[PDB]
Amino acid sequence: MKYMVYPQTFALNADRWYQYFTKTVFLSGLPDLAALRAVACDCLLQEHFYLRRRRRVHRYEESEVISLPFLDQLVSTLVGLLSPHNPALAAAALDYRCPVHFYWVRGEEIIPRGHRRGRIDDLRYQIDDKPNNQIRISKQLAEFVPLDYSVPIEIPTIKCKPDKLPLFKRQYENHIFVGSKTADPCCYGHTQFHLLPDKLRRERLLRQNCADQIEVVFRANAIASLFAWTGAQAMYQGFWSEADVTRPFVSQAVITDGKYFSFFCYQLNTLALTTQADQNNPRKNICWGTQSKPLYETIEDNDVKGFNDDVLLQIVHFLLNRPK
Amino acid sequence: LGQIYANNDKLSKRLKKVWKPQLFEREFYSEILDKKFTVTVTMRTLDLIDEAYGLDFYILKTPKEDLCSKFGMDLKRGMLLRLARQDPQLHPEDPERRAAIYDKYKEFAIPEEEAEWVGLTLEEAIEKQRLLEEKDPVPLFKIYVAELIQQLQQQALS
Amino acid sequence: ADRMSKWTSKRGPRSFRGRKGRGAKGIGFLTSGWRFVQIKEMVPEFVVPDLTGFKLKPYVSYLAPESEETPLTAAQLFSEAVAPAIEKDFKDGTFDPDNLEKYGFEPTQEGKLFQLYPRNFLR
Amino acid sequence: ANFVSWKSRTKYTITPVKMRKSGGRDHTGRIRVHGIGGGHKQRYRMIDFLRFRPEETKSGPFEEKVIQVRYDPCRSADIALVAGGSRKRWIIATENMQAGDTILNSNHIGRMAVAAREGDAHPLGALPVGTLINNVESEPGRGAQYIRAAGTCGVLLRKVNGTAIIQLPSKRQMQVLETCVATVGRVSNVDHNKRVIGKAGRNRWLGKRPNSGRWHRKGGWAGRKIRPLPPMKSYVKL
Amino acid sequence: YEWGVRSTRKSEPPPLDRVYEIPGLEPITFAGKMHFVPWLARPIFPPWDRGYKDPRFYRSPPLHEHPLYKDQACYIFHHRCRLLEGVKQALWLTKTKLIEGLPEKVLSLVDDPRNHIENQDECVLNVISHARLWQTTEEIPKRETYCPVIVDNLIQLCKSQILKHPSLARRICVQNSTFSATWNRESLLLQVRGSGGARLSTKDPLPTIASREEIEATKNHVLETFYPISPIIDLHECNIYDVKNDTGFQEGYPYPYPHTLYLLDKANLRPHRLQPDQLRAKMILFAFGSALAQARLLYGNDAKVLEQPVVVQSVGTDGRVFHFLVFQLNTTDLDCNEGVKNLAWVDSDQLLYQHFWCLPVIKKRVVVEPVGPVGFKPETFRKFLALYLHGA
Amino acid sequence: ARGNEYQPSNIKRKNKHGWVRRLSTPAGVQVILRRMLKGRKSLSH
Amino acid sequence: ARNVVYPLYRLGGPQLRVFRTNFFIQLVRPGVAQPEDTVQFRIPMEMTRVDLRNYLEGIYNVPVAAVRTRVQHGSNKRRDHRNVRIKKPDYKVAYVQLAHG
RNA sequence: UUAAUUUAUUAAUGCAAACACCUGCAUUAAAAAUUUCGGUUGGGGCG
RNA sequence: CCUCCGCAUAAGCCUGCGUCAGAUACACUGAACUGACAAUUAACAGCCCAAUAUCUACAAUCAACCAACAAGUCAUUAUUACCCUCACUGUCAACCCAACACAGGCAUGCUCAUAAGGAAAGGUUAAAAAAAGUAAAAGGAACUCGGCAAAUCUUACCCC
RNA sequence: GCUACCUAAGAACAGCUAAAAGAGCACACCCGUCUAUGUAGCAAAAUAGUGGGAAGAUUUAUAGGUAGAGGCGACAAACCUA
RNA sequence: GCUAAACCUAGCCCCAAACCCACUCCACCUUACUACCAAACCUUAGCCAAACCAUUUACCCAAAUAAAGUAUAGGCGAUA
Ligand SMILES: [Mg+2]
Ligand SMILES: [Mg+2]
Ligand SMILES: [Mg+2]
Ligand SMILES: [Mg+2]
Ligand SMILES: [Mg+2]
Ligand SMILES: [Mg+2]
Ligand SMILES: [Mg+2]
Ligand SMILES: [Mg+2]
Ligand SMILES: [Mg+2]
Ligand SMILES: [Mg+2]
Ligand SMILES: [Mg+2]
Ligand SMILES: [Mg+2]
Ligand SMILES: [Mg+2]
Ligand SMILES: [Mg+2]
Ligand SMILES: [Mg+2]
Ligand SMILES: [Mg+2]
Ligand SMILES: [Mg+2]
Ligand SMILES: [Mg+2]
Ligand SMILES: [Mg+2]
Ligand SMILES: [Mg+2]
Ligand SMILES: [Mg+2]
Ligand SMILES: [Mg+2]
Ligand SMILES: [Mg+2]
Ligand SMILES: [Mg+2]
Ligand SMILES: [Mg+2]
Ligand SMILES: [Mg+2]
């Protein structure tokens, strides 16, 4: 029996809980110009206006019909355009809705009831994620900060069972998966593109009193996804709980509602999440994050209004970085 | 539905026996109703019709215990109502035929109120009476306004 | 094989367990892909008044005197609602029969949002 | 009982239709026919037994091309998919019918008897005397009912006055109007009778349940004894 | 022999009470009560219509009353349409001459070693291996997952040549695009409704491959006809239809010219998968449809010989077998069976790899066949690359 | 080995001995009527 | 409200309003450790999480972010002197997470 | 069952009725139904 | 020291070894006994779908060769209609069917020997008879209805 | 809800030999040849060993059907809640 | 002297008389106790008695009594 951890979660203050489970400290902030703008605007206008649809769309279906193909288009074209600049993107493997699985153990528990009452049992967690887009490479991105990096900010602690934040246990095949099998040469990961589900739209949160939880959703989706992704990568190199990683594992994520974009960088320093391994372990995983900013203010008939360049530049920046 | 002895001797085996009538589909015309009906009849009823001098006479003369047909009773009610109402629907724009028909069967004249209940089952009668006596409850506003008006009129007079 | 126990949503197999409920009123419908649609109007809306400066409190002072118990009747309601108006009309001026609508009577309930019979409102 | 026949389709299609096994039971649920139950699952292919069926807003003789000749689980004979105009249908294939073959369906009775090619369906009046025929109709435009088992052929014995005597495969003569349509030649899957089941398991696959273990005295009765003859029975040898 | 047994059919209504036919009186029914009763008569209820409009409980008007109903029948070719005659039927319907093999120009684009991807064989083998084996957690990925992904990855591999040819930056791939093209053939009204993803779009229209004299030579050619099958076979006969032309995009859309359409036969089951001939027919008709939509947008609703021909390419895939097509529309007057004719260069039954072994084949204790693709040939990918590199 | 004839199933139970099944036939209605007369707490499953 | 007939809704009909709500709520101390934001309630069976959100927002003017409900089975194990099972009532439990921290 | 008593049932036939079906009567078969299997003589066969 | 068991789902059962306080088929003054208190929180699962016509020949087996027979487990389109969202219910246990805390019956996934789960001996003595094993001089069926059992692992027939 | 048979839509079958099969050895699973134990028993039919089958006329879960003048039966007068 | 023994009254029985029952609210024929969608009438047989059994073998029908166990019926038997 393992807890199923959902990157895209309805659970309140899930960022803090995920920080505890993954041993992650969150730090705010990061660690052509005309052709790119044209292409981005083109993709938006194509998915919103230009492309003609036989059946009329609804607001429940708009995320899958409009936003998802937009993100696919953006990723594909921006990989193509920045390929001359970044040779690594040329050799890169691009994945559409490929599963990422991680399974780890973090903490212990004394079974409360039943025939196994009073017996120690490890807490197991499984992340199953379906990122919208994924870029995988044969070489590894360089570390943002050195291993054995010290952060004064401490990892949040929970005073109750994980079950309290709506987390549930189930028993199914344990999977460590990076988006492809181990035989695949593109074992290392570059950038992941996530689209928030329609359930976790901003409008619905505003309709509730979860105005503060907006950014939380984004952060949760980062901490859980990248930790999984990097985790898997680290496990593909033979590193595990007892035999901890020798070099840091880094990855980048772009999380979007379809209008608002948020940017995340993750460094994995520890797979030593078990109690026996965590007994004397100073190292901790790091997540850098940015507040969500709108790519565009609004879309009119055929013209985008209030297009923000800095957001596009930030997408470009993540796509640009290369292995040493 | 009865029993028989096997070879018309009481000493032989007793057996269940059913005697059924012979049935025929025949067409009959009612001049009172000016309609042709296809009905299942026996030879007995055909002979009964012949001796009564027509279907209409047969239906009207014959009481309920002899007819032993729900349809017969409904036909009877139909004809009695036609005769009671002096219904013009029998022969439109032909007064002479209508008058002659009604003159022929003037014997079986009955009040309309009586005619309406002829050949009804108890259940049908219960339903009919319930429908007849069912009215929406009167707003008590109307009752109270009326009684106060009469009271105030009485007060004004004295 | 427990006849006496109350039949509940806990009791049957998977289909059975999903189908039954605890008597909560529906607030929408299901559609393709087992998607649930909440209809806003179907959800009951609590009409909660402003209680600021409300002098009445949960209990009454014991110093308050006892009164004779008289339930409200139709006759009473009519006497101190409609009777003064119609009597005023009769004594001074003219009272028009079949024009009771001016005195607050309605021939039909169909027009109104709140219908007395049958009831179209909650509590 | 709760039995509902699977034969609900009202519109003809060439798509194989899911069919429900009976088990030899009725709507009532009791057995009427023994030795039926639980073979390989089968899908029904609807057969147009009316060979002369002119298309909608069409009349007169029409031609069709054989698309394929195919095994059918539901019958002994092979079936053929045939296309004409914008219509595809399943028919009963003849002994020598191949993909690419062109077959004619006519309602024309010829004064001079037309040459009888194997694939074609003609009225019996058109057909010469002594021609091997199959898929015959008892009544004009009724549909084929009579010679449709594998490797079966009827013989048009004689043609009198608007009437034709045919020999059914059981060597029984039948009177048929000349206007009735039959398909020339022998039905496909000749030497179907020559097949060897080989093991008990094969019949079980075909959906045939084993015969009762009860021993029966005789299929036919014993001859009833007349009044004077009884002394002539039960003679004992000494 | 009528279809549909009596028992399964809707049961006959119960016989009407004799009280109804007797004229004078009115029947006493259980209508007064709000429930059925055996002894009382069965009432006649007037037909009930819901006053308001309920989307969940909507009943459609009959087909006659539909505004778009027409006495004449239109014949729609869509994605699910599967032609009986295959290439034959497509050639007839589109009024086209068939030429075996790719045109020389397209092939020559890859003939040079310069216009090759670095480590071609290795990269293509990796693509096949990723799709067939490495894709998912499952041991053996199904066609529904591997067919789209193989094509996507191959396109991405082609995109890698952007640094050599800057013109490759002037193209996009479009998913969920639908185009409508209507025309007439021998007084038969035909419409192609092309639905599917992987439409490659360019700002620059493709150059015309065939010269004028070749187009003139197509006059001497005659459409080979098939009897007794009608060319309308396996097309949707539709009475309630709209006559409209659609490119699938609003006016002023960048990348408005269709370069290549990629069609995927991704069905898991063989019977659901189109036959290679049928897939070829689908390609011809889709390419024709896209080209005709383009032509009718540019030159209006006039039937005339096109001075500037429209060129659209197609790649039809099974995930293992590829068919390549270049279609040149040179005429929009299709009603007459005689005249100049459109041109189709079709290369068929071109397979990347013979088979793929997901798990190792072991007989006894010794491994016979290793994991990976068997019977791989690169020239098919060269053809794929050739079609991509066209117009660059 | 016997005695384990009862292999419980709520679907089977409700289908065979349920209220609706009882009311389906006149015999079943009389069954309910008998049980009502005896004053049974449990008329059906 | 409970033990009352809810007027049937038709598409484009008026909003359903309750003027005097019949159901009543008791705030209960948790038996197990909960997050600081979480408040436990015992709820009538007929009540929904939507109703509870609206209830708390309306009557008590407390901001509500999330509601989760469960149904607790009361023990029927207990027997009286007549060997007749005594039912402890089934009740509904609601967990409410407060908004604005 | 080749015991006795039946043909209520089914099927067919003939004669009435009715202008092929249904009904009444009779006949023939199948299928059953009800009931019994006295006493002496080792016990069993022939007596 | 054992593990031929375990963990989970399905089905079944329905609070049936959680906390506190009490009296008291081996016993602990403790029990699964009595009373009170507490608890299973949805993402998993259940609970689905506007209408009328219309479409659907080509198995599965790594689906590629090859070979079939018993012939197969999953496809739409055209037109009309359509804009509100995350409700309700299952979630506990040492558990079910066998009158029992019964050497029995009990579907599936994963673990194929365990990371999970358990204890054959209340204490003693070392009688007979009884049961299950282990070893046995010389002989090797002499036993017996019969090589039954055990050991050993075997030929050639006859009848059906 | 056992069982006999059927219907609908499902599931299971390791390893080794085999020109490849209602094939052989052999797990799981199904059955019950022979012996011993047990005989108010663990058990109103079980246990241990030894056995027969174990890709099929196979085994098995779910839902449905056939009802006593009857059903169902690879006839044992078998099974139809000990 | 243990186990025990002892008790009087819940209630019931037969009559008489009199013609009984029937909504707090909500839920309840679908898997009852679940807010909310496209069809009933139809001879009882048999045990039993006849010392077997085969025709037959009392069974309420409009209010006591008496006619009278009479006339009658019936393997003219049992019996009715
Ligand atoms: Mg068959
Ligand atoms: Mg035999
Ligand atoms: Mg029992
Ligand atoms: Mg069972
Ligand atoms: Mg819940
Ligand atoms: Mg307790
Ligand atoms: Mg779900
Ligand atoms: Mg252990
Ligand atoms: Mg012990
Ligand atoms: Mg001892
Ligand atoms: Mg001893
Ligand atoms: Mg020895
Ligand atoms: Mg011897
Ligand atoms: Mg020897
Ligand atoms: Mg001896
Ligand atoms: Mg032995
Ligand atoms: Mg030994
Ligand atoms: Mg079946
Ligand atoms: Mg095997
Ligand atoms: Mg075998
Ligand atoms: Mg074997
Ligand atoms: Mg059997
Ligand atoms: Mg025998
Ligand atoms: Mg015997
Ligand atoms: Mg029994
Ligand atoms: Mg006697």
mmCIF file of N, CA and C (backbone and C1' of nucleotides) in Angstrom, chain A residues 6 9 56 58-60 113-117 119 164 166 168 171 198-199 201 204 207, chain I residues 7-8 17-19 40-44 82-86 92-94 109 116-118:
data_model
loop_
_atom_site.group_PDB
_atom_site.id
_atom_site.type_symbol
_atom_site.label_atom_id
_atom_site.label_comp_id
_atom_site.label_asym_id
_atom_site.label_seq_id
_atom_site.Cartn_x
_atom_site.Cartn_y
_atom_site.Cartn_z
ATOM 1 N N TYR A 6 -0.618 13.176 -6.390
ATOM 2 C CA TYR A 6 -1.062 13.795 -7.627
ATOM 3 C C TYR A 6 -0.373 15.145 -7.807
ATOM 4 N N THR A 9 -3.272 18.850 -8.177
ATOM 5 C CA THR A 9 -4.041 18.494 -6.992
ATOM 6 C C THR A 9 -5.034 19.595 -6.623
ATOM 7 N N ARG A 56 -19.323 23.182 -32.319
ATOM 8 C CA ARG A 56 -19.035 24.282 -31.412
ATOM 9 C C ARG A 56 -18.468 23.741 -30.102
ATOM 10 N N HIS A 58 -17.246 23.954 -26.010
ATOM 11 C CA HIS A 58 -17.817 24.360 -24.737
ATOM 12 C C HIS A 58 -16.688 24.637 -23.748
ATOM 13 N N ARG A 59 -17.017 25.334 -22.652
ATOM 14 C CA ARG A 59 -16.017 25.787 -21.696
ATOM 15 C C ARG A 59 -15.470 24.616 -20.877
ATOM 16 N N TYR A 60 -16.190 23.484 -20.872
ATOM 17 C CA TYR A 60 -15.709 22.280 -20.212
ATOM 18 C C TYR A 60 -14.696 21.545 -21.087
ATOM 19 N N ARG A 113 -4.146 -0.440 13.820
ATOM 20 C CA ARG A 113 -5.180 -1.431 14.082
ATOM 21 C C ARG A 113 -4.900 -2.701 13.281
ATOM 22 N N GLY A 114 -5.573 -3.792 13.671
ATOM 23 C CA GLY A 114 -5.548 -5.040 12.927
ATOM 24 C C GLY A 114 -4.537 -6.035 13.488
ATOM 25 N N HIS A 115 -4.263 -7.084 12.704
ATOM 26 C CA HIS A 115 -3.413 -8.185 13.129
ATOM 27 C C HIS A 115 -1.938 -7.796 13.050
ATOM 28 N N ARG A 116 -1.655 -6.697 12.338
ATOM 29 C CA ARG A 116 -0.306 -6.186 12.157
ATOM 30 C C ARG A 116 -0.107 -4.934 13.009
ATOM 31 N N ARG A 117 -0.916 -4.792 14.069
ATOM 32 C CA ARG A 117 -0.885 -3.617 14.928
ATOM 33 C C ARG A 117 0.418 -3.580 15.724
ATOM 34 N N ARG A 119 3.418 -2.942 14.544
ATOM 35 C CA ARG A 119 4.547 -3.314 13.707
ATOM 36 C C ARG A 119 4.909 -2.136 12.807
ATOM 37 N N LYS A 164 -4.548 13.189 5.903
ATOM 38 C CA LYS A 164 -5.379 14.317 6.294
ATOM 39 C C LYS A 164 -5.568 15.279 5.121
ATOM 40 N N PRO A 166 -6.079 15.437 1.522
ATOM 41 C CA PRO A 166 -6.722 14.333 0.799
ATOM 42 C C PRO A 166 -5.752 13.463 -0.005
ATOM 43 N N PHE A 168 -4.619 9.284 -0.512
ATOM 44 C CA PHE A 168 -5.239 7.978 -0.365
ATOM 45 C C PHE A 168 -4.257 6.885 -0.768
ATOM 46 N N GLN A 171 -2.773 -0.145 -3.914
ATOM 47 C CA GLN A 171 -1.724 -1.096 -4.239
ATOM 48 C C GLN A 171 -1.813 -1.462 -5.716
ATOM 49 N N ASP A 198 -8.899 21.366 -16.184
ATOM 50 C CA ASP A 198 -10.024 22.289 -16.208
ATOM 51 C C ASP A 198 -10.610 22.450 -14.806
ATOM 52 N N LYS A 199 -10.451 21.410 -13.975
ATOM 53 C CA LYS A 199 -10.919 21.391 -12.598
ATOM 54 C C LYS A 199 -10.193 22.458 -11.777
ATOM 55 N N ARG A 201 -8.858 25.302 -12.841
ATOM 56 C CA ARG A 201 -8.859 26.592 -13.515
ATOM 57 C C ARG A 201 -8.968 27.706 -12.474
ATOM 58 N N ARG A 204 -12.604 28.846 -11.252
ATOM 59 C CA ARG A 204 -13.253 27.980 -10.277
ATOM 60 C C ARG A 204 -12.718 28.267 -8.874
ATOM 61 N N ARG A 207 -14.194 31.313 -7.646
ATOM 62 C CA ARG A 207 -15.583 31.047 -7.304
ATOM 63 C C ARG A 207 -15.663 30.482 -5.886
ATOM 64 P P C I 7 -1.389 -10.454 5.185
ATOM 65 O "O5'" C I 7 -1.314 -9.359 4.033
ATOM 66 C "C5'" C I 7 -0.464 -8.208 4.169
ATOM 67 C "C4'" C I 7 -0.289 -7.526 2.838
ATOM 68 C "C3'" C I 7 -1.561 -7.034 2.171
ATOM 69 O "O3'" C I 7 -2.127 -5.865 2.751
ATOM 70 C "C1'" C I 7 -0.250 -8.155 0.573
ATOM 71 P P A I 8 -3.718 -5.758 2.916
ATOM 72 O "O5'" A I 8 -4.218 -5.507 1.424
ATOM 73 C "C5'" A I 8 -3.895 -4.281 0.744
ATOM 74 C "C4'" A I 8 -4.171 -4.391 -0.735
ATOM 75 C "C3'" A I 8 -5.622 -4.615 -1.135
ATOM 76 O "O3'" A I 8 -6.402 -3.431 -1.068
ATOM 77 C "C1'" A I 8 -4.240 -6.053 -2.390
ATOM 78 P P C I 17 -12.020 -6.839 16.006
ATOM 79 O "O5'" C I 17 -10.992 -6.780 17.221
ATOM 80 C "C5'" C I 17 -11.099 -5.774 18.244
ATOM 81 C "C4'" C I 17 -9.927 -5.881 19.186
ATOM 82 C "C3'" C I 17 -8.564 -5.629 18.562
ATOM 83 O "O3'" C I 17 -8.288 -4.232 18.499
ATOM 84 C "C1'" C I 17 -8.489 -7.615 19.860
ATOM 85 P P G I 18 -7.203 -3.669 17.459
ATOM 86 O "O5'" G I 18 -7.238 -2.073 17.673
ATOM 87 C "C5'" G I 18 -7.108 -1.556 19.018
ATOM 88 C "C4'" G I 18 -7.072 -0.049 18.984
ATOM 89 C "C3'" G I 18 -7.287 0.639 20.336
ATOM 90 O "O3'" G I 18 -6.034 0.816 20.987
ATOM 91 C "C1'" G I 18 -8.772 1.561 18.710
ATOM 92 P P U I 19 -5.910 0.606 22.570
ATOM 93 O "O5'" U I 19 -6.600 1.918 23.156
ATOM 94 C "C5'" U I 19 -6.011 3.223 22.968
ATOM 95 C "C4'" U I 19 -6.875 4.291 23.595
ATOM 96 C "C3'" U I 19 -7.359 4.003 25.008
ATOM 97 O "O3'" U I 19 -6.393 4.357 25.991
ATOM 98 C "C1'" U I 19 -9.186 4.710 23.679
ATOM 99 P P U I 40 -10.091 7.552 10.537
ATOM 100 O "O5'" U I 40 -10.511 6.865 9.159
ATOM 101 C "C5'" U I 40 -11.409 7.520 8.238
ATOM 102 C "C4'" U I 40 -11.752 6.617 7.072
ATOM 103 C "C3'" U I 40 -12.884 7.112 6.173
ATOM 104 O "O3'" U I 40 -12.690 6.734 4.812
ATOM 105 C "C1'" U I 40 -13.449 4.997 7.033
ATOM 106 P P U I 41 -11.771 7.604 3.833
ATOM 107 O "O5'" U I 41 -12.428 9.053 3.900
ATOM 108 C "C5'" U I 41 -13.622 9.398 3.171
ATOM 109 C "C4'" U I 41 -13.737 10.903 3.040
ATOM 110 C "C3'" U I 41 -12.796 11.562 2.034
ATOM 111 O "O3'" U I 41 -13.447 12.703 1.475
ATOM 112 C "C1'" U I 41 -12.404 12.473 4.167
ATOM 113 P P A I 42 -14.303 12.605 0.116
ATOM 114 O "O5'" A I 42 -13.180 12.523 -1.009
ATOM 115 C "C5'" A I 42 -12.644 13.711 -1.626
ATOM 116 C "C4'" A I 42 -11.906 13.357 -2.900
ATOM 117 C "C3'" A I 42 -12.767 13.041 -4.122
ATOM 118 O "O3'" A I 42 -12.016 13.421 -5.271
ATOM 119 C "C1'" A I 42 -11.470 11.153 -3.588
ATOM 120 P P A I 43 -12.743 13.910 -6.610
ATOM 121 O "O5'" A I 43 -11.786 13.348 -7.757
ATOM 122 C "C5'" A I 43 -11.522 11.934 -7.884
ATOM 123 C "C4'" A I 43 -10.138 11.691 -8.445
ATOM 124 C "C3'" A I 43 -9.652 10.235 -8.427
ATOM 125 O "O3'" A I 43 -8.994 9.910 -9.652
ATOM 126 C "C1'" A I 43 -8.046 11.621 -7.417
ATOM 127 P P C I 44 -9.477 8.662 -10.539
ATOM 128 O "O5'" C I 44 -9.285 7.417 -9.564
ATOM 129 C "C5'" C I 44 -8.090 6.605 -9.570
ATOM 130 C "C4'" C I 44 -8.310 5.337 -8.775
ATOM 131 C "C3'" C I 44 -9.601 4.586 -9.075
ATOM 132 O "O3'" C I 44 -9.516 3.724 -10.202
ATOM 133 C "C1'" C I 44 -9.420 4.898 -6.742
ATOM 134 P P C I 82 -30.218 24.828 -29.252
ATOM 135 O "O5'" C I 82 -29.121 24.273 -28.236
ATOM 136 C "C5'" C I 82 -29.489 23.799 -26.924
ATOM 137 C "C4'" C I 82 -28.338 23.060 -26.282
ATOM 138 C "C3'" C I 82 -27.053 23.853 -26.102
ATOM 139 O "O3'" C I 82 -27.082 24.701 -24.957
ATOM 140 C "C1'" C I 82 -26.550 21.714 -26.992
ATOM 141 P P C I 83 -27.184 26.297 -25.138
ATOM 142 O "O5'" C I 83 -26.483 26.869 -23.826
ATOM 143 C "C5'" C I 83 -26.579 26.194 -22.556
ATOM 144 C "C4'" C I 83 -25.202 25.956 -21.979
ATOM 145 C "C3'" C I 83 -24.493 27.181 -21.421
ATOM 146 O "O3'" C I 83 -24.951 27.447 -20.095
ATOM 147 C "C1'" C I 83 -22.996 25.934 -22.784
ATOM 148 P P C I 84 -24.428 28.735 -19.280
ATOM 149 O "O5'" C I 84 -23.163 28.156 -18.500
ATOM 150 C "C5'" C I 84 -22.976 28.348 -17.080
ATOM 151 C "C4'" C I 84 -23.667 27.259 -16.284
ATOM 152 C "C3'" C I 84 -22.756 26.332 -15.495
ATOM 153 O "O3'" C I 84 -22.327 26.939 -14.280
ATOM 154 C "C1'" C I 84 -24.464 25.080 -16.584
ATOM 155 P P U I 85 -20.759 27.108 -13.970
ATOM 156 O "O5'" U I 85 -20.322 25.651 -13.496
ATOM 157 C "C5'" U I 85 -20.971 24.999 -12.386
ATOM 158 C "C4'" U I 85 -20.723 23.508 -12.423
ATOM 159 C "C3'" U I 85 -19.557 23.018 -11.580
ATOM 160 O "O3'" U I 85 -19.892 22.893 -10.202
ATOM 161 C "C1'" U I 85 -19.574 21.925 -13.698
ATOM 162 P P C I 86 -18.760 23.069 -9.078
ATOM 163 O "O5'" C I 86 -18.293 21.574 -8.789
ATOM 164 C "C5'" C I 86 -19.226 20.539 -8.428
ATOM 165 C "C4'" C I 86 -18.557 19.187 -8.516
ATOM 166 C "C3'" C I 86 -17.396 18.955 -7.544
ATOM 167 O "O3'" C I 86 -17.517 17.705 -6.873
ATOM 168 C "C1'" C I 86 -16.731 18.433 -9.752
ATOM 169 P P C I 92 -11.870 -0.029 4.345
ATOM 170 O "O5'" C I 92 -12.230 0.434 5.826
ATOM 171 C "C5'" C I 92 -11.431 1.410 6.527
ATOM 172 C "C4'" C I 92 -11.454 1.128 8.008
ATOM 173 C "C3'" C I 92 -11.040 -0.279 8.408
ATOM 174 O "O3'" C I 92 -9.628 -0.398 8.515
ATOM 175 C "C1'" C I 92 -13.056 0.292 9.510
ATOM 176 P P A I 93 -8.897 -1.708 7.961
ATOM 177 O "O5'" A I 93 -9.302 -2.823 9.024
ATOM 178 C "C5'" A I 93 -8.826 -2.761 10.382
ATOM 179 C "C4'" A I 93 -9.472 -3.838 11.218
ATOM 180 C "C3'" A I 93 -9.388 -5.256 10.664
ATOM 181 O "O3'" A I 93 -8.125 -5.839 10.951
ATOM 182 C "C1'" A I 93 -11.601 -4.818 11.356
ATOM 183 P P A I 94 -7.511 -6.956 9.981
ATOM 184 O "O5'" A I 94 -8.272 -8.275 10.446
ATOM 185 C "C5'" A I 94 -7.778 -9.586 10.122
ATOM 186 C "C4'" A I 94 -8.002 -10.530 11.282
ATOM 187 C "C3'" A I 94 -9.442 -10.661 11.789
ATOM 188 O "O3'" A I 94 -9.736 -12.026 12.076
ATOM 189 C "C1'" A I 94 -8.012 -10.072 13.574
ATOM 190 P P G I 109 -4.570 -13.778 -12.272
ATOM 191 O "O5'" G I 109 -3.988 -12.388 -11.702
ATOM 192 C "C5'" G I 109 -4.034 -11.210 -12.547
ATOM 193 C "C4'" G I 109 -3.404 -10.049 -11.820
ATOM 194 C "C3'" G I 109 -1.984 -10.278 -11.291
ATOM 195 O "O3'" G I 109 -0.995 -10.031 -12.283
ATOM 196 C "C1'" G I 109 -3.347 -9.409 -9.560
ATOM 197 P P A I 116 8.890 -7.197 6.963
ATOM 198 O "O5'" A I 116 7.522 -7.801 6.415
ATOM 199 C "C5'" A I 116 6.582 -6.985 5.690
ATOM 200 C "C4'" A I 116 5.423 -7.829 5.226
ATOM 201 C "C3'" A I 116 4.826 -8.756 6.279
ATOM 202 O "O3'" A I 116 3.951 -8.129 7.205
ATOM 203 C "C1'" A I 116 5.214 -9.997 4.325
ATOM 204 P P G I 117 3.996 -8.572 8.740
ATOM 205 O "O5'" G I 117 3.378 -10.063 8.739
ATOM 206 C "C5'" G I 117 2.041 -10.276 8.218
ATOM 207 C "C4'" G I 117 1.755 -11.755 8.161
ATOM 208 C "C3'" G I 117 1.757 -12.482 9.507
ATOM 209 O "O3'" G I 117 0.527 -12.293 10.193
ATOM 210 C "C1'" G I 117 3.004 -13.726 7.920
ATOM 211 P P G I 118 0.465 -12.485 11.774
ATOM 212 O "O5'" G I 118 0.430 -14.086 11.958
ATOM 213 C "C5'" G I 118 1.238 -14.692 12.995
ATOM 214 C "C4'" G I 118 1.523 -16.121 12.617
ATOM 215 C "C3'" G I 118 1.985 -17.025 13.765
ATOM 216 O "O3'" G I 118 0.866 -17.589 14.437
ATOM 217 C "C1'" G I 118 3.491 -17.212 11.944
#
